[PDB]
Each structure stands twice: as structure tokens, then as C-alpha cells.
Write an enzyme that holds these catalytic residues in place. Sequence first.
Site, PDB file in Angstrom:
ATOM      1  N   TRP A 100       0.848  -1.208  -0.055  1.00  0.00           N
ATOM      2  CA  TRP A 100       0.032  -0.035  -0.097  1.00  0.00           C
ATOM      3  C   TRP A 100       0.830   1.277  -0.021  1.00  0.00           C
ATOM      4  O   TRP A 100       0.477   2.149  -0.548  1.00  0.00           O
ATOM      5  CB  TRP A 100      -0.944  -0.176   1.218  1.00  0.00           C
ATOM      6  CG  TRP A 100      -2.014  -1.013   0.895  1.00  0.00           C
ATOM      7  CD1 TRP A 100      -2.193  -2.087   1.528  1.00  0.00           C
ATOM      8  CD2 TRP A 100      -3.161  -0.875  -0.165  1.00  0.00           C
ATOM      9  NE1 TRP A 100      -3.422  -3.025   0.869  1.00  0.00           N
ATOM     10  CE2 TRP A 100      -3.866  -2.056  -0.133  1.00  0.00           C
ATOM     11  CE3 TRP A 100      -3.275  -0.035  -1.218  1.00  0.00           C
ATOM     12  CZ2 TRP A 100      -4.947  -2.461  -1.027  1.00  0.00           C
ATOM     13  CZ3 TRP A 100      -4.173  -0.272  -1.911  1.00  0.00           C
ATOM     14  CH2 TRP A 100      -5.074  -1.451  -1.976  1.00  0.00           C
ATOM     15  N   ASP A 172      -1.030   6.432   6.388  1.00  0.00           N
ATOM     16  CA  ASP A 172      -2.172   5.449   5.959  1.00  0.00           C
ATOM     17  C   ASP A 172      -2.787   4.469   7.019  1.00  0.00           C
ATOM     18  O   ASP A 172      -1.841   3.539   7.267  1.00  0.00           O
ATOM     19  CB  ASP A 172      -2.001   4.875   4.473  1.00  0.00           C
ATOM     20  CG  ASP A 172      -3.159   3.912   4.038  1.00  0.00           C
ATOM     21  OD1 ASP A 172      -4.161   3.840   4.975  1.00  0.00           O
ATOM     22  OD2 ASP A 172      -2.886   3.220   3.149  1.00  0.00           O
ATOM     23  N   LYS A 196     -12.119  -1.332   7.937  1.00  0.00           N
ATOM     24  CA  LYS A 196     -11.330  -1.990   8.603  1.00  0.00           C
ATOM     25  C   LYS A 196     -11.953  -2.234  10.112  1.00  0.00           C
ATOM     26  O   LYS A 196     -12.385  -3.040  10.698  1.00  0.00           O
ATOM     27  CB  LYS A 196     -10.014  -1.974   8.575  1.00  0.00           C
ATOM     28  CG  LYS A 196      -9.212  -2.273   7.164  1.00  0.00           C
ATOM     29  CD  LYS A 196      -9.432  -1.411   6.324  1.00  0.00           C
ATOM     30  CE  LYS A 196      -9.362  -2.097   4.744  1.00  0.00           C
ATOM     31  NZ  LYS A 196      -8.174  -2.854   4.676  1.00  0.00           N
TER      32      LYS A 196
HETATM   33  C1  LIG Z   1      -3.396   0.005   4.264  1.00  0.00           C
HETATM   34  C2  LIG Z   1      -4.635   0.288   3.300  1.00  0.00           C
HETATM   35  N1  LIG Z   1      -4.371   1.315   2.209  1.00  0.00           N
HETATM   36  C3  LIG Z   1      -5.193   1.517   1.243  1.00  0.00           C
HETATM   37  C4  LIG Z   1      -6.134   0.440   1.056  1.00  0.00           C
HETATM   38  C5  LIG Z   1      -7.214   0.824  -0.136  1.00  0.00           C
HETATM   39  O1  LIG Z   1      -8.207   1.241   0.572  1.00  0.00           O
HETATM   40  P1  LIG Z   1      -9.652   1.310  -0.554  1.00  0.00           P
HETATM   41  O2  LIG Z   1     -10.130   0.314  -1.366  1.00  0.00           O
HETATM   42  O3  LIG Z   1     -10.743   2.113   0.224  1.00  0.00           O
HETATM   43  O4  LIG Z   1      -9.062   2.424  -1.486  1.00  0.00           O
HETATM   44  C6  LIG Z   1      -6.540  -0.406   1.915  1.00  0.00           C
HETATM   45  C7  LIG Z   1      -7.658  -1.506   2.119  1.00  0.00           C
HETATM   46  O5  LIG Z   1      -8.583  -1.476   1.331  1.00  0.00           O
HETATM   47  C8  LIG Z   1      -5.534  -0.594   2.867  1.00  0.00           C
HETATM   48  O6  LIG Z   1      -5.629  -1.859   3.964  1.00  0.00           O
END
Ligand SMILES: Cc1ncc(COP(=O)(O)O)c(C=O)c1O
Lengths: 357, 360
Positions: A100, A172, A196
Amino acid sequence: QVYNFSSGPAMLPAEVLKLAQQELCDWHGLGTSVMEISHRGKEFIQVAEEAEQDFRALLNIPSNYKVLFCHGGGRGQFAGIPLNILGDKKVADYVDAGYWAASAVKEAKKYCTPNVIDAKITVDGKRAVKPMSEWQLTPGAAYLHYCPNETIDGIAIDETPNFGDDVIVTADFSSTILSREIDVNRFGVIYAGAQKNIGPAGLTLVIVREDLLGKASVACPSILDYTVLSENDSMFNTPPTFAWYLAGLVFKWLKQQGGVAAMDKINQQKAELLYGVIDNSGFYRNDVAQANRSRMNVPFQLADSALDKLFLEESFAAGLHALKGHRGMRASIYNAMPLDGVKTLTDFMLDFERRHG
Amino acid sequence: QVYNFSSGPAMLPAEVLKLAQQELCDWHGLGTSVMEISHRGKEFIQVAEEAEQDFRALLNIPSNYKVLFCHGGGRGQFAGIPLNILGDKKVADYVDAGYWAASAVKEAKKYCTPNVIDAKITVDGKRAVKPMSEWQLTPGAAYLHYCPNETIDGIAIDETPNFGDDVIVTADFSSTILSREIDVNRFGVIYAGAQKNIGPAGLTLVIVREDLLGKASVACPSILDYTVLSENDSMFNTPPTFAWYLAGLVFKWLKQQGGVAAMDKINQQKAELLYGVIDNSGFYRNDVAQANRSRMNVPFQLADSALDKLFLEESFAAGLHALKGHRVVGGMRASIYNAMPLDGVKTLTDFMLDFERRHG
Ligand SMILES: Cc1ncc(COP(=O)(O)O)c(C=O)c1O
Ligand SMILES: Cc1ncc(COP(=O)(O)O)c(C=O)c1O
């Protein structure tokens, strides 16, 4: 009983979903659902404000931070961060030690030329993260970005940022917010997709230090512009009202449990139980260094991955859902997951090893 | 019985909400909610695909259009339209005949120089919209944008676009989509926040002609980039899964009602009933021209606005919720979307007549 280990969308607290069900058609005696009322009516405004205040209390957010309830998910903020707080600057530091964090880098390249800090290290054969004291920052960078909980990798960075006042820390927290106490004062921006530990999917929380407002790019869509969102208390346009209501119920539930410090203690027990079973087994493995092991997302591999499909079918049949990892397994054990769910999982894992190991 | 005249978030079909309630904790025998499951699992993929298929069938969407389930609301598309289909151009034509069209212009100024077409006219004391033939378009404009249903103003533009191939028509259908049959082929982009006729708030629908993809601005956030969204089947990132599921239930409910042609006939009956009561009463007024009267959003004013508060208290007590007009214009506003039964409009008009008798 079904225990749902999905990483996102994730389980809600069972008591929260039961309450939402009870009042889905007729909320607080109004004869309509909470999802059918105006966001500018007195009733929904109270829901929204109580959710904001409960979140502030749970995390002990200082008064110089805005708390925004946003559209667009975590990946929305991969664009939202540079679009709001680059200002006139053309570089920001991004720490990459997982999927991520790397995804955030890719989006940032639309808006600047990021300096990428590779923080991955291997220590005694285990995957770890370089300490923050070793992160080589760029003088004058608009901000620093990292991911304290890498959902797919099972890697957590727990240390509190202690950089100079000139460093604007952004982070994040999607898959770990509300799982432990954090020092919000040390950050410029904390964000989390809700799906989450906050609520259902379709809602994102952003904590933004107030002095960072007022320099959004003209290209920033107004729905992602922190200054416009703050002006309008996150009702510049129609919010995801049901998701915001559900987040408010989760915050009430967290208060009832004793708050984030109470969650921290149960999450420690859950993680110790699951990692203990993995480490005392030659059949299951996790190779993340102890100090960087996430308590929220626990990947593990089987010694014979030809058994993966059977593990997934039989765990599902035992009421243990959504254990598949990314292209072994991944047990997500968020705040809502009770210790009994992790006990049921580890009992299944021990039995499966007895059968097939 | 409660009838909810909110303009957005709006009422859902009662049968849809009841089904969602019944299966909220244990969906399709899984022992989990539909809102707690992976959007990439086979179960949610089926929900998502059937929702898309059902929407295409209901509106008769041709196969050369993409159907995107998006984050960000209607105002997200005020930015998404120029960020995706300006391309290398700097001019787009915007028609302004109401609040939401003007709001789209304001957002557009972040990305281009809109040529603003003032389409407001007054005919015989009534507010109307200039015919599309008087819309002076700009040669070479990247697209044309208008709002066929002005939610606050009660103004509908029902006339079918008949522009040439060089005009790319884009349109904010938020408060009218699925209320009548439309010719999707006449449009380049149709978009709608879900929270009037599609589903709960938190979801937006975008219908985009496929040849318009591939020219998004680098500055467009990936979550708003139609090319990225289409390539990933609206699962570039985590969708608003519960809202998408609920929209899917609304589409199944619409099929059960007879589809959009059936709703068109009921919506005509509802609007004729309510406008008739307003027109035949000296106590209530609406000053939108007949040809531009919305069937979805019906503003009206009391002859003595000092009775506004009492009207709102007594209508609420009668089970008629959310009739206050938008803060920008005041008065009352009855939103009578697809989910609102004819019996709700009959209850409203009987209330209005009784209120006039008691207080007028
Ligand atoms: C640490 C992290 N960053 C980003 C995301 C991406 O989130 P989204 O699908 O809401 O863009 C997630 C999970 O979905 C995540 O666990
Ligand atoms: C015609 C129209 N355009 C735009 C909007 C704004 O949409 P949102 O609040 O989802 O941004 C609405 C209603 O909310 C609307 O009725």
C-alpha cells in the site's frame, strides 16, 4: 457461529450490525430509515456530530486537527494528500516497505516527483522495516508519507514519529486505526478507509492539522478538498449517510468496550495466540520480524501449498471465512473480531495440521 | 404510515428496505452481511454484475456504453466530467437554468473555461428554459453539459438532444434517472448520484460512451478516472458495497413494477394530481412553466408564508416528512421520486386541501 477474517470490507461488531438491523426501517421512532433522511436535517446532523466527537475522544485528537468524513476510499487519499498539501512544492518523501505504501507512491507520481525511501530490511532472515531514525528525508519536502500497517504484507510500523517541526508526517492508518493509542500531535495527516475498524466501505476518515489547510491545488476536486470539506463540516455534498451512521455506532460500541486502550489489550492477546500457534508449528510459517508483526493482519503460509485449497474450503465449512492471502493465507483480526474467533481459528489450524502435516 | 418527501437522501422502496433488513446479518445463507464480504469474491461479483445488467436493461443502455459504479456523488462528477473528457481542449459549453447546473459551472472553472449558456426565460409570468435551438454552442467545444432536472427549482428539461456528432452531450440526471424512458444513444455521458432513484447515498452511476475513454487528465484521481474504472469493472478500489447491493435491489424492484414505462405512467399521475391541487388553489402557488415542470421535485409557496412553520409542523404530524424547501429559495418542496406511491401524493394533497380549509 461464523467468524469472518476478511481484510476489507471487514466484519462489523456483531452488536452494531444487530442494532442497525433492528432500526433499519424505523429509526429512533421516525418511521423512516436513517439512510432516508436529509443530511442537513437536525436528526442526521446530531448523528454526524456525535460520530465526530466520539472519534475525537477515542483517539484523543487535539483541537487543532479537523476530522473529515470523506468519499473515495483509501486510494482517494493517495490523490487527496498531494492535491491538498503539496502547495507549490514538487517533492514529498514516500516510505516504501509494502504494497500500500508503494501504491501511494504510484498515485503521487501524477502530482509530483516523489522521493522514494526503501525501508525494507531483512534481519536474521525475517522481513523488517528500517527505524525512522534512519529514514533519509529531503530538506524542504512538502510532507513525508508512510503506511503503519501493511494489510497484505502483515507488516506494522508501531513507532511514534519524532521528526522535526519542518517534517509534515502523513500516514495511511486504514487497517490499524483505533487498535492502539497513537500520538496524533506528531502527525500532519492521518487517514483511514473505514472498512477495517471504523464502519462499512464507502467512507474514509481524515484527520488533518488545521495549519495545512488553505493551499489545495486548484485541480483538487472540491469533494476531496480538505479546506472545502472543513468549511462544510464534511457536508459540502451529500455524505455516505448510512456508512457515517454505522461508523457512529462502531464508535459507541468502542466506548462501551472501554475505548482504544481496552481494544489494545484484547488485540495483543489475539495476536499472541495466533502468532504463537504459527511459530510453534513446522506446518505454518510467517517470516515477518517480531517487532514489525501486525496485530491486525496475519499472513501465513502452509508448508505444502498444495493444501491451500483444502484449507480454504474446510475452514469456510467450519465457519471461518475469507482466509485467503494475496497472489498462502491471511487472517485479519480487527477490533470487532472477538478472542473466541481467534481461538476457533487456531483450534482449526491445529486440527488441520494433525490431519495433513 | 409515513411518506417521506426528502429530496436526497430520499426514500427507498419499502419492500427493498424490508428485504435488506431481513438479510442484514445473514445474507444468502453466508452468516455474514453483504456489507462484510470481499468485493472480489464470487458472491459480491454476482451482485455487482447483476446490478449492472439490470440497470442496462431498465434504461436500454447500448453495449457501446460503460456503466460505472463510482464514489464521490453528483458533485464528484462536476469535477470528473472535465477531468475525463476535456482531453486537450480548454472550452466546454455549460447550460445554466438552475442551481445544480450553475454549481457544475463553478467546479468546471477549476479545469477549463466554460462557455455559460443562460437558458432561463420567463413566459407569461412563468419560469421556463430556452429551447435547445437557442443554445449557442461553441464550435470545437469538448462537450456540452446540462441538468435535465433541477432538484431545488423544480425545472425539468425533457426535450431530447438532437445535436450533431461533433457535440458530446453530458447530463446530470441525478434527480430524474429511471423516471421515464430516454434515448441513451443521444448522450456522451449520463451521471446520477444514487440517492434519488437508484439507491442510498454513497454511490454514483456514470454511463459513458466507450470512445470517450482514454483521454483523462493526468491530474484526474484514479478513483475518478473513467478509463481506470472501466478497465477494473468499477472495482479499482473498494466499492461502496452496501450501496451497490441496495441499488441492485432497487433495480430488481423496478423490474417488478413493470420497469421504467410503468413508472413513467405512475409518475405522470402523481405530478398531475399535485400540480392540479396547487394550480386550483389560491393558497398554494408554483410558477414554473408547464413544459418545464419537474415530475420529481415540486416546489410550491404558501400565499401567507407566515404559515410555513405551521405547515411543516402539521404535515410532519400527519406523517408527511421533509417538505421544507431548499434554504436557497425557501417555500415547500415535495420530492415524489419513483419509490413514492401515488397514495403518498394523494395523502399529501388531501393534507394540503385540509390545511387550506383550516387556516386559509
Ligand atoms: C493500508 C491500506 N491502504 C489502502 C487501502 C485501499 O483502500 P480502498 O479500497 O478504500 O481504496 C487498504 C484497504 O482497502 C489498506 O488496507
Ligand atoms: C441535479 C443534482 N445535481 C447534483 C446534486 C448533488 O449531488 P451530491 O450531493 O451527491 O454531490 C444533486 C443532489 O444531491 C442533484 O439533485
